Amino acid sequence: MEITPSDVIKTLPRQEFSLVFQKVKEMKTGAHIINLGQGNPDLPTPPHIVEALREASLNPSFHGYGPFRGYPFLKEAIAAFYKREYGVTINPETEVALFGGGKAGLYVLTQCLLNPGDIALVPNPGYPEYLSGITMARAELYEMPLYEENGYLPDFEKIDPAVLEKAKLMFLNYPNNPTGAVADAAFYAKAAAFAKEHNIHLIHDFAYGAFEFDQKPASFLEAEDAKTVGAELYSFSKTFNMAGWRMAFAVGNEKIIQAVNEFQDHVFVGMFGGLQQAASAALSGDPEHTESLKRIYKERIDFFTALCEKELGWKMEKPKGTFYVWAEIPNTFETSHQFSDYLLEHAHVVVTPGEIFGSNGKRHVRISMVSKQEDLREFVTRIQKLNLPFGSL
Amino acid sequence: MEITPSDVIKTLPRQEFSLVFQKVKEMEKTHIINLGQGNPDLPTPPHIVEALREASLNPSFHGYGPFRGYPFLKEAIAAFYKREYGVTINPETEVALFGGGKAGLYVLTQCLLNPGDIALVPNPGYPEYLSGITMARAELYEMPLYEENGYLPDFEKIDPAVLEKAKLMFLNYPNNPTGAVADAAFYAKAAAFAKEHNIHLIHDFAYGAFEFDQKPASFLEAEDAKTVGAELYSFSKTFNMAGWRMAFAVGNEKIIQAVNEFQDHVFVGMFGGLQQAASAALSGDPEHTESLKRIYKERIDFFTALCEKELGWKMEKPKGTFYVWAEIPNTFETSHQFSDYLLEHAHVVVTPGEIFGSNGKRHVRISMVSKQEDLREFVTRIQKLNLPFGSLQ
């Protein structure tokens, strides 16, 4: 019989993937399911990015194989974006690697950085895909608990010094999926120093790096020692409404980037030059596009949380970043998975059960602000019609 | 200090990436004819480019798509395989999508081999077969492909004990680098062999459009082929879409399921615009491809005739692919010494056979990826060097 290696089905059950499947399966017809589960941007890519792709696709240079490591124009664009947005200086020739989206970036970084038997420090709650690369690398996982009281920042002192002896890699994610928590330059310097002291490679997942509402967002690479110990993964998916386009990059330590390049040389031949040109247009575009998108999300969050609170008494802290609301489940309901099933079956809305993000996600759900006002009001309206007590304590 | 994984320390550099780099440096210092990497010189056909351009305007593609790819492409893949090879493929269960064949090889290897498992790799063979086995932390047993056997493996010469442990075998016809072709009988033997020994069979069909006398046979035409394996098909050579990075696998549903369960966590599909472009390539009129094949055949006829006349370098015409596989001069020690020599002293690129395995040590591969007048200049550059093109084999 066909016998796949054991590790594949030893990865998390692709819950967003089981989510798209059950949803499509719910189709009188594709019933008006208000899907606030997956963080799938609802607004179109800015027309100037689309036009850069349309124009690029006519250039026959991009039809054949290109540079393995991506086009120098994109790497220079990424340098310029980082200087503009965060005042960081990046050497585009040695400190930049291209990826087919952030998911792909996390996987590759992990394979280049972790050996069997090493420990990887992973935040709980946190993005489930951190476990995927760790699993594929046959490495061990240690959870750093993220608690609300600490603004969902890790307490590095609370980690077993034995765990620390075997730790080779740590993941951090701010602005945070799923909690909406933000971090400033201060925490990044603290994190980088901890990483330096214990000789741990630091991967900062900056997928929502455009979306902090209560200050201009800080990059991990603004910290002292940041470029010595790690790398920052940046996705186009959220910043530019480009989730479909599958593009991302990492900036950081030239030695990490060299490992990435050596890996990717065997798996990829860069990526479609048309996509790279579109990426370049995104990065060089006027910051007003991204600022507008941040206002859209900030107003949807303001609207949703105020409406949930007024009408349902369902209290939610306003996130300071990302487009996610991290809501405690009312006491009327049982576990996160049972609550999420219930909402989908009875109202016809999708939220993501918090347990997906780790055991500290118990009794929470993640709600993504990826719909306009009417859809968000209707979500609350459909809940209100359930006639269950939703009030918080 | 920054310490990369042992996997990365164990990986040899990709020769094509090394040449890209050397060629670029040489060009900057001031003209190279590159017949190394199999990089099509002709642009992507217009109807494919236009399909992308128009699809890029569809905002449904701007957001996350189905993780396993759009059903419309999968359906196109099934229709294509029926029209071209008379093979029945279930578009819902027997098709997976990849970011290029190179990425498909990686994924397939990760999905079919545990660390420690044995893979049967042809020698000579496409360099990434070896790379993937390394990245999988697997062990390789060579299957020698000898000229006298038409560069087909002799399965009955493989130690039956290795077959108890062998989990995977790679085959590739039309063959890179040798140009050898395989028939339906060969494929029925391979499948039967794989079934007896419970070996997963991956057929690399990258040159499936380019067999000159006949349309090549698909592996999947064979009895029990879909029972033991899968076939990898690339858009790169068939459609001058190398820079686009698109490929698929067709085969048994369990192999495909494993691919899907892997890729869910690493590759969310690719941009729908690309998928539309692909679908247009496959539904496109077969005579565009037939035409392309004839161009390559005329280049091969021209080049082998000119090399014989002008250099005295006698080469067999390949049965398929756009590659010529040629013995190096009797005065040189190795294929790498010869390749480096040509680059330095003639300013032309050929690929050293040694990167395909030890059986390529006295050969170079030459790609017919320039027009006839450029092929002529390539010959005239070499002619000035007065090399001895005698055989020792």
Give the 3-state DSSP-derived string for chain A, with helices as H, strands as E and coil as C: CCCCCHHHCCCCCCHHHHHHHHHHHCCCCCCCCEECCCCCCCCCCCHHHHHHHHHHCCCHHHCCCCCCCCCHHHHHHHHHHHHHHHCCCCCCCCCEEEECCHHHHHHHHHHHHCCCCCEEEEEECCCCCHHHHHHHCCCEEEEEECCHHHCCCCCHHHCCHHHHHHEEEEEEECCCCCCCCCCCHHHHHHHHHHHHHCCCEEEEECCCCCCECCCCCCCHHHCCCHHHHEEEEEEHHHHCCCHHHCCEEEEECHHHHHHHHHHHCCCCCCCCHHHHHHHHHHHHCCCHHHHHHHHHHHHHHHHHHHHHHHHHCCCCCCCCECCEEEEECCCCCCCHHHHHHHHHHHCCEECEEHHHHCHHHCCEEEEECCCCHHHHHHHHHHHHHCCCCCCCC
Token pair for A57: 């696709």
Separation in Å, CA of B41 to nearest CA in chain A: 7
Amino acid code (one letter) for A160: D
Q: Are residues A334 and A372 in the same domain?
A: yes
Positive/negative CA dihedral, B277, B282, B288, B294:
positive
Q: Which residues of A touch B20 (CB under 8 A)?
A: 67-68
Q: Are strands B348-349 and B229-234 parallel, antiparallel or unpaired?
A: unpaired
Q: Are residues A174 and A207 in the same domain?
A: yes
In A, residues 192-221, which contact B (CB 8 Å cutoff)?
199, 201
Other C-beta atoms closer than 10 Å to the C-beta of A381 total 14
Query: Whole-angstrom Cα distance, residue A66 to residue B52?
Result: 19
User: For residue B226, what is the nearest residue in chain A, using CA coordinates?
Assistant: A2
Q: Rounded to whole angstroms, what are the CA distances from B27 to A32, B23, B30, B352, B367?
A: 59, 6, 5, 20, 20
Q: Which residues of A touch B4 (CB under 8 A)?
A: 112-113, 255-256, 258-259, 262
Q: Are residues A317 and A350 in the same domain?
A: yes
Other C-beta atoms closer than 10 Å to the C-beta of A372 total 13
Amino acid code (one letter) for A35: N
Q: Are residues A277 and A303 in the same domain?
A: no
Q: Rounded to whole angstroms, what are the CA distances from A132 to A108, A138, B247?
A: 11, 10, 23
By the 10 Å C-beta count (0-12 exposed, 13-18 middle, 19+ buried), A18 is classed as exposed
Q: Residue holding tokens 């480096």? A: B340
Query: Whole-angstrom Cα distance, residue B160 to residue B91?
Result: 36
Peptide bond into B318 cis (omega under 30): no
Query: Whole-angstrom Cα distance, residue B74 to residue B213?
Result: 29
Amino acid code (one letter) for A254: E
Other C-beta atoms closer than 10 Å to the C-beta of B390 total 12
Query: Whole-angstrom Cα distance, residue B324 to residue B301?
Result: 11
Token pair for B72: 């419309």
Is B99:B245 a contact under the CB 8 Å cutoff?
yes
The β-bridge partners of B119 are B140, B168
Q: Rounded to whole angstroms, what are the CA distances from A138 to A10, A33, B134?
A: 11, 39, 15
Q: Are residues A228 and A208 in the same domain?
A: yes
Cα angle: A47, vertex A375, A387; to 5 degrees: 165
Query: Whole-angstrom Cα distance, residue B136 to residue B130?
Result: 10
Three-state SS for B362?
Answer: coil
Task: Judge whether B393 lies within some domain.
Answer: no
Q: Are strands A230-235 and A34-35 parallel, antiparallel or unpaired?
A: unpaired
Q: Are residues A14 and A136 in the same domain?
A: no
Closest CB from B39, B52, B99 relative to A64: B39
Query: Whole-angstrom Cα distance, residue A389 to residue A28?
Result: 29
- The DSSP H or E segment spanning B231 is strand B229-234
Query: Whole-angstrom Cα distance, residue B230 to residue B253?
Result: 9
Is A320:A300 a contact under the CB 8 Å cutoff?
no
Task: Judge whether B391 lies within some domain.
Answer: no
Query: Whole-angstrom Cα distance, residue B175 to residue B155?
Result: 17
Query: Whole-angstrom Cα distance, residue A344 to residue A334?
Result: 15
| 8-state DSSP, B113 | -
User: For residue B129, what is the nearest residue in chain A, using CA coordinates?
Assistant: A266
**A364-368, strands of its sheet edge to edge:** A324-328, A364-368, A352-353
Of A143, A133, A226, A217, give the one whose Cα is nearest residue A180.
A217
Task: Judge whether A270 lies within some domain.
Answer: yes
Is B301:B293 a contact under the CB 8 Å cutoff?
no
Choosing from B253, B284, B315, the residue where a domain stops is: B284
CATH of the domain at B167: 3.40.640.10
Amino acid code (one letter) for B275: Q
Closest CB from A16, A20, A269 relative to B102: A269
- Phi, psi angles (nearest 5°) of residue A98: -95, 150
Interface mutation target, options A265, A352, A368, A371, chain B, most CBs of B under 10 Å:
A265
In B, residues 130-169, which contact A (CB 8 Å cutoff)?
131-132, 135, 167
Separation in Å, CA of B330 to nearest CA in chain A: 32
Token pair for A32: 């008006």
Three-state SS for B29?
Answer: coil
Is A17:A40 a contact under the CB 8 Å cutoff?
no
Q: Are residues B48 and B188 in the same domain?
A: no
Query: Whole-angstrom Cα distance, residue B330 to residue A28?
Result: 74
Amino acid code (one letter) for B119: A
Query: Whole-angstrom Cα distance, residue B353 to residue B363?
Result: 5
Task: Judge whether A125 lies within some domain.
Answer: yes
Choosing from B233, B251, B284, the residue where a domain stops is: B284
Cα angle: A108, vertex A114, A115; to 5 degrees: 125
Determination technique used: X-ray
- Where do runs of H (alpha helix) occur along chain B? 6-10, 15-28, 46-55, 71-85, 101-112, 127-135, 160-165, 184-196, 225-228, 253-263, 272-283, 287-311, 335-346, 372-383
Query: Whole-angstrom Cα distance, residue B353 to residue B350?
Result: 9
User: Which are the residues after which chain A is interrupted (C to N > 2.5 Å)?
Assistant: 27
DSSP conformation letters of B244-293: G--EEEEE-HHHHHHHHHHHTTT-----HHHHHHHHHHHHS-THHHHHHH
In B, residues 83-122, which contact A (CB 8 Å cutoff)?
99-100, 102-103, 106, 110-115, 117
DSSP conformation letters of B52-70: HHHHTT-GGGTS---TT--
User: For residue B100, what is the nearest residue in chain A, using CA coordinates?
Assistant: A268
Token pair for B85: 């090879």
Query: Whole-angstrom Cα distance, residue A213 to residue A323?
Result: 10
Q: Are residues A54 and A121 in the same domain?
A: no
Contacts of B315 (CB under 8 A, 6+ apart): B304, B307, B308, B324, B325, B326, B327
Q: Are residues A253 and A314 in the same domain?
A: no
Choosing from A285, A316, A338, the residue where a domain stops is: A285
- The DSSP H or E segment spanning B366 is strand B363-367
Token pair for B247: 């490929």
By the 10 Å C-beta count (0-12 exposed, 13-18 middle, 19+ buried), A26 is classed as middle
Of A254, A273, A380, A341, give the one whose Cα is nearest residue A23.
A341
Indicate left, alpha or beta for A38 from its phi (over 0: left) and psi (-120 to 50: alpha). Answer: beta
Q: How many domains, chain A?
A: 2
Cα angle: B144, vertex B145, B149; to 5 degrees: 125
| 8-state DSSP, B356 | G
Q: At what angle do helices B272-283 and B71-85 cross, to 10 degrees?
A: 20
Q: At what angle do helices B372-383 and B287-311 cross, to 10 degrees?
A: 20
Q: Residue holding tokens 């990986």? A: B11
Query: Whole-angstrom Cα distance, residue A365 to residue A384?
Result: 18
Q: Are residues B111 and B246 in the same domain?
A: yes
Amino acid code (one letter) for A145: P
Counting every residue, how long is chain A? 393
Query: Whole-angstrom Cα distance, residue A38 to residue A233?
Result: 20
Three-state SS for B321?
Answer: coil
Of A187, A181, A189, give the one whose Cα is nearest residue A151.
A181
Q: Which residues of A touch B52 (CB under 8 A)?
A: 57, 274
Amino acid code (one letter) for B197: H
Other C-beta atoms closer than 10 Å to the C-beta of B60 total 11
Is A23:A38 a contact under the CB 8 Å cutoff?
no
Range of B329's domain? 1-62+285-385
Token pair for B304: 């082998």
Q: Residue holding tokens 């890209």? A: B20
Three-state SS for B144?
Answer: strand
Contacts of A320 (CB under 8 A, 6+ apart): A175, A180, A181, A182, A212, A213, A214
Is B365:B324 a contact under the CB 8 Å cutoff?
yes
Q: Are residues B308 and B213 in the same domain?
A: no
The β-bridge partners of B234 are B247
Other C-beta atoms closer than 10 Å to the C-beta of A56 total 22
Query: Whole-angstrom Cα distance, residue B267 to residue B54?
Result: 24
- The DSSP H or E segment spanning B96 is strand B95-98
Task: Judge whether A317 lies within some domain.
Answer: yes
Task: Judge whether A391 lies within some domain.
Answer: no
Query: Whole-angstrom Cα distance, residue A56 to residue A276?
Result: 9
Interface mutation target, options A15, A65, A293, A323, chain B, most CBs of B under 10 Å:
A65
| 8-state DSSP, B211 | B
Q: Are strands B323-327 and B348-349 parallel, antiparallel or unpaired?
A: unpaired
CA gyration radius, chain B: 21
Query: Whole-angstrom Cα distance, residue B222 to residue B189?
Result: 9
Q: At what angle do helices A102-113 and A254-264 cross, to 10 degrees?
A: 100
Q: Residue holding tokens 């930049």? A: A96
Q: Residue holding tokens 């050497």? A: A91
- Phi, psi angles (nearest 5°) of residue B36: -90, -100
By the 10 Å C-beta count (0-12 exposed, 13-18 middle, 19+ buried), B1 is classed as exposed
Cα angle: B114, vertex B119, B125; to 5 degrees: 135
Q: Rounded to whole angstroms, what are the CA distances from B157 to A368, A379, B140, B163?
A: 60, 67, 16, 11
Q: Are residues B195 and B337 in the same domain?
A: no
Three-state SS for B21?
Answer: helix
A256–B contact, CB cutoff 8 A? yes
Task: Judge whether A166 lies within some domain.
Answer: yes
Of B243, B257, B225, give the one whose Cα is nearest residue B39.
B243
Contacts of A207 (CB under 8 A, 6+ apart): A102, A173, A177, A233, A234, A235, A237, A238
Token pair for A27: 């189709």
Of B152, B101, B106, give the one whose Cα is nearest residue B129.
B106
Query: Whole-angstrom Cα distance, residue A261 to residue A263?
Result: 5
- Phi, psi angles (nearest 5°) of residue B392: -110, -10
Other C-beta atoms closer than 10 Å to the C-beta of B348 total 21
This PDB structure is determined at a resolution in Å of: 2.0
CA gyration radius, chain A: 21
Q: At what angle do helices B127-135 and B101-112 cross, to 10 degrees?
A: 40
Contacts of B131 (CB under 8 A, 6+ apart): A266, B11, B12, B14
Query: Whole-angstrom Cα distance, residue A198 to residue B30?
Result: 48
Q: Which residues of B touch A58 (CB under 8 A)?
A: 49, 53
Task: Judge whether A393 lies within some domain.
Answer: no
Query: Whole-angstrom Cα distance, residue A304 to residue A129?
Result: 28
